[PDB]
Design a protein around this ligand. Structure first.
Ligand SMILES: [Ca+2]
Lengths: 316, 270
């Protein structure tokens, strides 16, 4: 053990998706991440958000995270926290930074669709004629993989799809109006905002990164997975690999541009953008499934470890 | 038109982790050696293979310039990159069988390419995955049985991961004790009393204040809610009503962030 990632304030990892900090009620959502960071001197807590899928309103995930942050501070005596969220977890983190600015030192979002997901929009349209969405081979593939990851649920198929409702272009647009942030750029400019924000007298360091494994090819526009070689074992051991390529292809055909399977580069931009060059799909971002990633994918654990060191050097 | 950072975005703002040195003035055969390389490698997507190689050589030199360790480090670098080179589908479900075999293959390459360094590089990683892959299989089976299979499986952990897990569990359990008292509706005095005899008086005072802050917030929000309802009852057009309520919120909640929070609570059942 060392102090490489020994930040001043505790780090709270904030999951997104269907619910809880677990995948299939067995493995950690943030696979091998909390243990790695702790070995490097960081005091790392993992939020476990269940119940309401939405980040907004009474008892929404934002209020749940707010309550958790206060419990962590009460237990530790720390006065602020560093929030690192994935997918919807980035939006949940923004909630806390907006309503309790004095309790937050930094907000980092990983693969967060701040401007919505084209796939979430696709699903929304498909469900207008088919509530199951199974009439779509891509949606069927998505549900098959993500449905098996849902924890503490007796109806994973439904929950896996419900998790997309908060990520539509329309829903996120409303969310951004309700929770403004200097970290967001001008709507439709595909540019990030400010690296820091002043809320009340509090100062927050804002960061983000995303994966762009799914790249468009020729032209219906084609798509390729740059995380894997011409032929990779990840397509066999990690079923989400091919599924995310398919969902990412649908996004590309909706003019999303390069993406991670669910979130486009443009939508992921927030605060100081560390990188959008990582050859990752949505799940590689959290070292899933079970640490399996394509041959061309950077180490997500090393990336997070590097960022917490970055946070430490910034004084938080 | 100067650059905002000297290093590629992936590394900018961070420092390289330290290369471990043993007594024999040589590189300590620990996973820390691998972490050094994976660090630089996080920038592989923004650099040409040549630029990447040049960076690693420079980073190694910065720490071990003019020493046996430097040559040793460059040696591992060669064997590591050989690993990635030697490292080089039906839309179905997941099977712990194939995933188990893949790890068996990757473990083979690590031995051929990294050899002596295969253990410190992927030792822990291999166990972590193999172990978890089992719990998943046991969970997904005819078994009734499962509990006994998992209880035994969880007896194959190393003294390091078991201790690491106990520490993380203790860390979270303190938070859970506070959360449980809130769910039980503990008054600030009850919260203080119970926490004082488990987490200590300092945490008890903080937890009690937290309860008091929550109770005061609830009272203030409820008082505001009555005023909000009086405005909503005036029958104004939606736009005008929302604007008047927004104004009331801004005047009532002036602590930074609270006006936004009240707006959130107004959008649900509260
Ligand atoms: Ca993966």
């Amino acid at each position: 053990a060392d102090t490489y990632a020994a930040t001043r304030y505790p780090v709270i990892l904030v999951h997104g998706l269907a619910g809880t900090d677990k995948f299939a009620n067995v493995v950690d959502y943030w696979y091998g991440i909390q243990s790695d960071l702790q070995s490097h001197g960081a005091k790392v807590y993992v939020a476990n958000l269940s119940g309401f899928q939405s980040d907004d309103g009474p008892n929404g995930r934002g209020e749940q995270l707010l309550a958790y942050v206060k419990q962590v501070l009460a237990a530790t005596g720390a006065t602020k926290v560093n929030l690192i969220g994935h997918s919807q977890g980035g939006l949940t983190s923004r909630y806390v930074a907006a309503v309790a600015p004095q309790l937050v030192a930094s907000v980092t979002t990983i693969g967060t669709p701040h401007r919505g997901s084209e796939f979430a929009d696709f699903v929304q349209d498909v469900l207008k004629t088919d509530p199951t969405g199974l009439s779509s081979t891509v949606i069927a593939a998505f549900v098959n993989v993500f449905g098996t990851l849902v924890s503490s649920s007796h109806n994973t198929d439904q929950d896996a799809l419900a998790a997309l409702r908060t990520l539509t272009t329309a829903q996120t647009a409303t969310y951004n109006r309700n929770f403004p942030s200097a970290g967001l750029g001008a709507p439709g400019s595909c540019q990030t905002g400010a690296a820091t924000e002043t809320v009340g007298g509090s100062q927050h360091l804002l960061y983000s990164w995303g994966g762009t494994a799914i790249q468009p090819t020729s032209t219906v526009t084609g798509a390729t997975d740059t995380s894997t070689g011409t032929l990779d074992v990840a397509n066999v051991t990690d079923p989400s690999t091919l599924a995310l390529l398919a969902t990412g292809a649908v996004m590309i055909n909706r003019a999303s541009g390069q993406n991670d399977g669910l979130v486009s580069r443009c939508s992921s931009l927030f605060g100081q953008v560390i990188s959008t060059s990582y050859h990752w799909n949505h799940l590689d971002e959290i070292n899933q499934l079970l640490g399996v990633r394509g041959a061309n994918a950077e180490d997500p654990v090393a990336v997070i470890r590097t960022h917490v060191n970055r946070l430490k050097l910034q004084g938080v | 038109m100067p650059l905002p950072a000297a290093l590629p975005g992936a590394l900018a703002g961070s420092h390289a982790p330290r290369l471990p040195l043993a007594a024999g003035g040589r590189l300590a055969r620990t996973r820390a050696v691998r972490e050094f390389f994976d660090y630089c490698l996080t920038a592989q997507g923004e650099l040409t293979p040549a630029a990447l190689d040049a960076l690693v050589r420079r980073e190694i030199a910065a720490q071990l310039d003019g020493s046996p360790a430097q040559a040793e480090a460059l040696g591992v670098w060669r064997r590591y990159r050989a690993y990635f080179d030697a490292l080089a589908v039906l839309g179905d479900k997941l099977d712990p069988a194939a995933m188990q075999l893949a790890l068996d293959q990757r473990a083979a390459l690590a031995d051929r390419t990294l050899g002596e360094w295969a253990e410190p590089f992927f030792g822990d990683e291999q166990r972590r995955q193999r172990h978890d892959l089992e719990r998943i299989r046991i969970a997904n089976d005819t078994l009734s049985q499962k509990a006994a299979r998992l209880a035994a499986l969880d007896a194959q952990l190393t003294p390091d991961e078991r201790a690491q897990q106990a520490a993380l569990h203790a860390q979270q359990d303190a938070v859970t004790k506070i959360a449980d008292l809130q769910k039980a509706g503990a008054t600030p005095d009850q919260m203080r009393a119970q926490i004082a005899q488990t987490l200590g008086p300092e945490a008890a005072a903080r937890a009690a204040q937290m309860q008091q802050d929550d109770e005061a917030w609830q009272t203030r929000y409820q008082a505001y809610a009555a005023e909000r309802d009086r405005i909503a009852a005036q029958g104004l057009a939606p736009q005008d009503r929302d604007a008047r309520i927004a104004q009331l919120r801004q005047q009532t909640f002036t602590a930074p962030g609270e006006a936004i929070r009240a707006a959130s609570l107004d959008r649900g059942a509260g």
